[PDB]
Amino acid sequence: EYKDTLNLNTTTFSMKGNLSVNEPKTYAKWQEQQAFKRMQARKDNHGDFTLHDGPPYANGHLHLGHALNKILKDIVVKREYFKGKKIYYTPGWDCHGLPIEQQILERLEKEKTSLENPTLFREKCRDHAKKFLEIQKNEFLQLGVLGDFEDPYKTMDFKFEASIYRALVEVAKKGLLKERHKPIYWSYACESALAEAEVEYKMKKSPSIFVAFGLKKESLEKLKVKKASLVIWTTTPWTLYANVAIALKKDAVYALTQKGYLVAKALHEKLAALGVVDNEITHEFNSNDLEYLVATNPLNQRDSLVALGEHVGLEDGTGAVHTAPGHGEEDYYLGLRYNLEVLMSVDEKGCYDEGIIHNQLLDESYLGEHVFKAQKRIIEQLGDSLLLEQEIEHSYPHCWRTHKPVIYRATTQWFILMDEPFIQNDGSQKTLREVALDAIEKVEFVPSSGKNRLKTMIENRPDWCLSRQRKWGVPLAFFIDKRTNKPCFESEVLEHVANLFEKKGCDVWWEYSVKDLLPPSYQEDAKHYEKIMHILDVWFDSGSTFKAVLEDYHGEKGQSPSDVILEGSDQHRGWFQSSLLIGCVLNNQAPFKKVITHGFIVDEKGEKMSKSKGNVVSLDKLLKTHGSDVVRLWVAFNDYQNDLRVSQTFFTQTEQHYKKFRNTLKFLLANFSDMDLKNLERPHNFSPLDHFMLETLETISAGVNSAFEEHDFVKGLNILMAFVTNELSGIYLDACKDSLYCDSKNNEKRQAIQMVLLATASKLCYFLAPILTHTIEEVLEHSQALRIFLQAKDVFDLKDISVSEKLHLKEFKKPENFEAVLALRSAFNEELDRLKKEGVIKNSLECAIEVKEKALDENLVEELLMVSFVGIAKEKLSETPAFTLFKAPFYKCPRCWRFKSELENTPCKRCEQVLKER
Template identity: 40%
Template sequence: MADDATTARDYRETVFLPDTPFPMRAGLPKKEPEILEGWAALSPKGLYGAIRSRRQADKAPLYVLHDGPPYANGAIHIGHALNKTLKDFVVRSRFALGYDVDYVPGWDCHGLPIEWKIEEKFRSQGRRKDEVPAEEFRRECRAYAGMWIEAQKTEFQRLGVLGDWWNRYATMDFSSEATIVAEFHKFLASGQLYRGSKPVMWSPVERTALADAEIEYHDHVSPTIWVKFPVVRDQKNTLGGAEIARKIIEEHGRGGPAPAPQEIAAANSLVGRASIVIWTTTPWTIPANRAIAFNPQVEYGLYRIDELEPTEGGVHWSSEGDLLILARKLAPEVFKNARVARWTELEILPAERIQSLECEHPLAQLTKDLKYKYDKVVELLPGDHVTDDAGTGFVHTAPGHGTDDYLIWLKTGHRDIPETVDADGAYYDHVPLFGGLKVLETEGKKVGKFGDANNKVIEALKEAGNLLARGRIEHSYPHSWRSKAPVIFRNTPQWFIRMDHAVDALGGKTLREVAVQSLADTAFHPEAGRNRIGAMVETRPDWLISRQRNWGTPLAMYVDKATGHPLNDPEVNARILDAIREGGADAWFTRPDSEFLGHHDPAQYEKITDILDVWFDSGCTHAFTIEGREDSHWPADLYLEGSDQHRGWFQSSLLEGSGTRGRAPYKAVLTHGFTMDENGEKMSKSKGNTIEPQAITKESGAEILRLWAAMVDYSEDQRIGKTILATTTDAYRKLRNTMRYLLGALAGFTEEERVTDYADFPPLEKYILHRLWELDGQVKAAYEAYRFSDVIRPLIEFCQGDLSALYFDVRRDSLYCDRPDALKRRAYRTVLDEVFNRLTIWLAPLASFTMEEAWVTRFPEAGPVALRVIPERVDAWRNDAEAARWAKVETVTSVVMGALEVERREKRIGSALEAAPVVHVADPELLTAFEGLDAAEVFRTSAATLVAGDAGAFRIEDVKGVSVDPNKAEGKKCARSWRILPEVGTDPRYPELSLRDADAVAYWDATHG
């Protein structure tokens, strides 16, 4: 009967196959918006509000992530997506760890990029910026920023980012602007604020000062010149003893009359005979020269040009016999550039001799008869910043156009800082020879290009006879990170916060000292960030906080015209703050001074109309976002931004908090790198290598972007592209398949089925429970340390290895074919339930959409998975012995699988169930590992025999002492489980089945009668 195909029973209905509505194909672009709609409906603040309410009801500890504000200007890019996704990982993982999490997203709204967009808008209407009333201009800026806040908010929410979007902050909110001004007033009251005239980075194109954080460096080709400064005074000239004097005596001839002492002195003097040579890449700064810097530790020499190289046209800018003073190490390179064929070193000049010299300006002779002259004496000043690595060993010093120049000028007692270039990048009219010439073009098609100044200065040096050589060099040059135009150092009055001024408000410490201590008290992820920001803080100059623009928070204060001191009247400041809270920053610019000054005479005070540096704005966000709120706390637990914010938001927040509260507004700082294309190149629209997050979301779903962000090492620069996203999608598919299998295998699982006594679990279940115990510790530790890749990667490996390749495969036969009340099947489903419960919450912070879909598929009434907390670790599941056992079992299994693969390839068997291998094991420990196990089930064969020894036919080189005889299984094939066993047919009720399957079908028949 069993062989009669027409009468044999179809046993498929008796097999307990997995069953789930969870689809294999995710359809994420369609499914994710549905999930987002469900989250939004959970509370007035959506899923975020629902979780916070649950945690607050449970009196959970509070965790505060303070959002670094993106700029409200344009659609989000991949860097934004990475940043906000990482923040969402933090928020969701802290919720999963049992915290109540405060996260208020915010935006930076003031500054040049928005101003530029509005300027473009008015230009398109035929209106120049200076023709537009300032109030109208700022109103347009505010509307533009507001539009992009809403657009970006929608894009961030589409990525699944949780936060209090309903109470978002913006630096342009009236309340925010009032708080920023209040923070500014604190620096005013403490004495840390001052107005100084010093060279700052200036953008002529944008007509404003820029801070270091607003500068980026690009390769730029600059003209280089070697310039002679004639010596006009030699205070250390001595009689005799100098090599040059000896040579003069010899030239009188042997036996002739000896030269007179005054002749020797004249010969030894450098006045009118020698020139000091400088090298610079900014010829336009020569008119501002006031000194030459040298280093006493560098060796200098006096050189005579003996012979010039032939040149085309015979043009040279030096002559044979010229005497030049150079660093000895650099002299050969200088002469090479000056096309000097032969020279003589006449004398080594000690440092005191160098310092005794004075020079005239190289353009002095051209202006003798002009109203404005280059008639200042050029001093020699010692400075450690001078090196003999390049140039001439001397540094042209223009105090109005360089930090080192400015500092060395002040150090020697000088206070007059020359002003040579105006706000538009042109020489002032009083600059001899060059008045009105442009250093940088600010209008027309050449905007941002260097003007005629460099060439005109070089031509004038030629005419004066003081150009030694010229060339070109490609080097890194500062540019505005907004306009991308070159910037210049320019002397201009600005407002600064002192870094090294001890104040009572800081306990007698300086802002630098407090900031350095704050960094020591801060945790950094990665730790390298500490040194990076620390080095910047330890060496940074005073904080430049003023800008000459319209769209921003004002330095709302008055200055006494008679004394130059800011007015620090609490009543005046209070009226200013009230007005800004009511009408925003516009109130400062539009309301009459008398409304603020009260009894003070407006005629005696200057109203400051500069705006605050936008970094000061964002550095204050802690003061109006987290401080003082009942459901938040100060300082924040974490600030998280890109590594460029060591010089930006991290630093401005550090200085603001340290200067007003004596510490940083954060306990920890996390930084991520930049996102590059697949080749490691910076993304650029002109290159066509950008990856837009909107496109990924539309084509593949936000989950793929989230999984990519979870898998990369965000602490370094990371890459993204089609190939990488394809790999990410493949990893996602494997995760999804795992969840689908779990849901199908757990269909109908009830508490009555659960195995509750650990002792009843078979060895394989104990091993999987041990792995859950192990992973629980790893996952929690990784989330605590923000190491998200150390969560996702081990879990993917667990799903692919321990689960799919081992556990699911070994237990598939038991799941499908054992009777439902069989202990092994119940144990299997019990462990699968534990696996599902943990995987869904472990992965929920990262693969949020998929874990939500999986959780709700199984428990539609339980609420979102994000409401859950990661379960307590079950220490009773730890079983190191079982872990060691299965490592040995897998070693033996790998050889068996190798043997069966050969059999399949040679077509001697079709599937592993046709085999009954004999496994020879020489190692007693490996053999012992199989005690209590069904070897056939482990090998996925119908039968298996383990014997001591090593006499098998098949072996693997990497595994010693294990060999296999891949014998074919004997017996009949079970019509239900397909195992080939001698016992098939011995149960007369079901002659086509094995005894186990016959018992299971009998159970099925009894319960489905």
């Protein structure tokens, strides 16, 4: 055996990643050495790139969805860094979010206690946010992400609270912040108002009842019938107490049945089929003639006005709608239109209050009962007026914080108005809805489809309720002047308070007297002013991050508008929309130029992960099992715009891809490890195969770069993997192994191969660096030749190199064309496959080929087909229109194993010379 006379060609870079052990060391080093600050300080930075982090709640450990999000951000930011830009990426945390306060409250309830002191409760919430911000920060670093994690933004910083308040001041001074009284979403479970982003729709069972309201004697006399009762359909028996009207569709036909029921003619057939009313119609009336008749509520005997409603539908129900201004927004406006009572005797806890007694709306026995709990008894009380009871399922609004169903209560709250013209920064006049719709058209969405989701919501959304009733957050800190009963928006007052918040934070709103909160010049008038104590919607706070982070730091944490924001596609309903709206108030544009979205992490079945469902995979477990580089590759190598399913099969597949990349890098490093570095300084005579590989490398590099530019990491990785698998491994490394292992170290053709391998490794490192950063750091650590060739101490010194310049290639060189020779290779491999099956030969190297097409380069044919001889021999094995195959007319060389030896067990001519080398 001559095995030990070959070139060793080994590298210290290991085939095994040992990721669990090695990655923590890399990430710990990047922290100690301040790699992100070093990236920002890079002297040759050219151009700038800002990614503005949307703030996760400072509560709980990270889940897989957080890791997906931060990994994608990291790939995007690293790509821009390696392109040569100065990067701005300050991660941040939402410290005032409802989860923080809900968690504290649940703990106190679990501990059989409560905390009623505002300053101390706020302190406990801050302490909780501090704890989980640190935990999450360290968990994010364990993913190998780089950003300003040592100087994150935090909504609970006093400066940040002031920035939020100053954003609210801008809204107020532009005339868009106004008090309104109307029914809105009300969470009884947390005694607070809420808006759309705080609601989760869930299917819920409900009573579904048809109720007769008999017309009064005098109305029957006017209509000229003996009996008539309008039938209403409702899923909310709990609001029947607050009925003031029955609304009909204008200019529509109502049918009166033989038994005396009055319903829309258009719905009679359906209603009679349900058994709600009898089948025989006796009279038809126009709704215009029914308006101003009066009926009797069967629940409490009160009058109910027959009214005409705008757009009463005839698709469901009966065409007659029980109208309760206190509990329905459309109902409210109809009530006001007819100057009717707004009956609302349900308290902040969702219970009937003394109003039902005072106004005789409902029996005293209901006092203190929760509206949903009373419904069964209410339905029983309806007696013969209940024509049909069903149970249905419908999509119903739930308070996301408490998971409980919401109700609606007429209440006075603060709103940002959507359809109120305001003065634009350019002097024109537009509503916030108009500005937001204009703004969206100037934003790039990835996927494109995301634009339509947000646009539709902005087209449809109502005024935004800002005021909340809770124990933690930023106060809506304005004074009401008791002399005018209106808010004080005087600049000197607002700036005074904002300044106090900047220095001391918002605890002063609770602790200071009105006098102390006012400027010196108002203190005489302190007695006239009373604090608003409502808390701001935290969706407003987070929608203000652009102002608090990008604008208020004047560019030091990135530009406003940001270049990119990147979050879950559920943020169209959340942070994207709130940030859009606040940006449109302040700047009349979006505070972002581009939105990239990802889907959710789900189980192998595609279902969402829940503790209850038992299908939760912890991030900790995933990372320990596979390592961060594998998890990162799994993100990048998949369709992250849609849901990503966690299963063993998919992780196994990603592991196989990681292995192929790592094994290829190892082979390259091993095979240029012995090259004298003096080769870097000179041109080489490259072979046709060398040139084909370099030209291929250039073509695929352009393709990967294009795919990565459009955030299509799957497309780019498939290009890279095909190049690695097919042209590089399949063709180039197979052809070059004989030279690499068996040629003299002095051999010029070998040195030229090494230079190609060096260029190839260089491009692999550049394109993989955003994704497998730890692994490429490790590559460079193990390869002095790569560090010198790339002029890089470490991964942060990588740049997109010009292989042409680095290899001294000639500008006019005509590209190779390997179509003919590759077609011959394919045909030969097909033939060889068949012969192997027949047991005729075991290896291509056992063969000689005589090619019919004499145009082809014979050295190249030998390399690509891996035969031992090109030309005619004696023992024919097979023939085709293209070529004849024969047994090679030589012995197997004991050293290189090619059939090129004239004598048995004797080194071939090449090998003899290398063995004798002095």
